[PDB]
């Protein structure tokens, strides 16, 4: 691999051969495939006397490989201290960064090297730097869930309140991985449960569409708004509804939630727990007060939406709790209609008792929100 014996001497960790090769004839910045110096080499075994006679010779710690990793990206990769050390003695930049935009505090906070990065942030490392990304290195200590990179960044200025590029702060990430410790860290050093991203989803939104309901209940804890709406309309319980957990949706109607609360084209939560299938909410929802002949915008009731999604056994607990057929919405379909347009042979027959003789879907509005900070 294009591999000097001065790089072999750096890979097994001679100080006397490869002392002696740069005595007589030897480049000590002479690069490899994948872009990789002796000093690379030696750092990242760690080797931590080989790696202060190269850097006393001519090593410049500044080179990087292709992937944008200089020696102090690798030794804080393998929590080298001592290595780290004789590198940023010998003048290694930490203001340097990889192509993802990640500084070796960012490779600690992502490895969890906790001594690593004490020693960076005691000699000049920037808590809050952040590539085009705009992941900070407190962002990837809770993506990797090292609570002690976190409780170590937080008080040398780990700004919770630090937004990536989809506007998620740290304390997103812990509510959407139910780190509830790192959460409690974070809220303690001010961070805000009403958070919002570029879509307005705020960390309670996450906590309630993963289901956590410890999580929850912390944020709510920390005047988190349960009734706030995302950009279109969607409520943490309109994310229970979507996804269906109970324990949330009780912690969440609790605290006082309003179980009706209406998106931008008038949907309920009972509406989007009626379109995907989640009976057991659909009870909840019903035992406390919900409209069960509530009309979105275009007039679709919640037995509209399991009508068209094909939930049989939804709609015969609506028809129990007073869903009333021959309702008819603005496009003109009624719930018969729509389960014989396509097809549902169950929800047509349950239908067809209960309805008098007589091409548009309604969809709720969704939350595509993600954020790619592994790898």
């Given at each position: 691999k294009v591999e000097t014996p001065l790089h072999m001497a750096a890979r097994?960790?001679?100080?006397?051969?490869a002392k002696y090769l740069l005595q007589n004839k030897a480049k000590v910045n002479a690069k490899a495939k994948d872009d990789q110096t002796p000093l690379h080499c030696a750092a990242r075994?760690?080797?931590t006397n080989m790696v202060k006679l190269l850097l006393e010779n001519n090593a410049n710690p500044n080179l990087a490989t292709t992937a944008g990793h200089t020696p102090l990206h690798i030794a804080a990769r393998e929590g080298h201290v001592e290595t780290v050390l004789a590198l940023l003695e010998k003048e290694a930049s930490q203001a340097c960064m990889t192509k993802k935009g990640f500084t070796?505090?960012?490779?600690?906070?992502?490895?969890?090297?906790?001594?690593?990065?004490?020693?960076?942030?005691?000699?000049?490392?920037?808590?809050?730097?952040?590539?085009?990304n705009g992941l900070t290195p407190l962002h990837v200590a809770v993506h990797h869930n090292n609570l002690d990179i976190?409780?170590?960044?937080?008080?040398?200025?780990?700004?919770?309140?630090?937004?990536?590029?989809?506007?998620?702060?740290?304390?997103?990430?812990?509510?959407?991985?139910?780190?509830?410790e790192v959460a409690r860290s974070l809220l303690q050093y001010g961070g805000s449960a009403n958070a919002e991203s570029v879509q307005g989803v705020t960390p309670l939104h996450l906590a309630a569409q993963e289901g956590h309901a410890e999580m929850?209940?912390?944020?709510?804890?920390?005047?988190?708004?349960?009734?706030?709406?995302?950009?279109s309309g969607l409520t943490p319980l309109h994310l229970v509804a979507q996804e269906g957990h109970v324990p949330v949706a009780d912690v969440l109607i609790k605290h006082g939630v309003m179980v009706d609360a209406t998106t931008r084209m008038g949907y309920t939560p009972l509406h989007v727990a009626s379109?995907?299938?989640?009976?057991?909410?659909?009870?909840f929802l019903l035992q406390h007060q919900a409209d069960v002949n509530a009309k979105t915008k275009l007039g679709y009731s919640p037995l509209h939406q399991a009508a068209q999604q094909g939930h049989t056994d939804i709609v015969t607990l609506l028809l129990k709790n007073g869903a009333s057929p021959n309702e008819v919405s603005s496009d003109g379909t009624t719930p018969l209609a729509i389960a014989k347009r396509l097809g549902y042979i169950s929800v047509t027959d349950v239908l067809k008792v209960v309805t008098d003789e007589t091409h548009r879907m309604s969809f709720p509005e969704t939350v595509d929100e993600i954020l790619d900070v592994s790898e």
């Open positions: 097994a960790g001679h100080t006397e051969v075994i760690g080797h070796p505090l960012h490779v600690a906070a992502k490895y969890g090297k906790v001594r690593v990065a004490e020693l960076l942030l005691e000699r000049d490392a920037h808590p809050n730097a952040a590539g085009k976190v409780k170590l960044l937080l008080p040398r200025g780990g700004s919770p309140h630090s937004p990536a590029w989809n506007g998620y702060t740290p304390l997103h990430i812990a509510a959407k991985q139910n780190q509830v929850v209940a912390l944020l709510l804890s920390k005047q988190a708004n349960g009734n706030l709406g995302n950009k379109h995907y299938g989640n009976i057991k909410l659909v009870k």
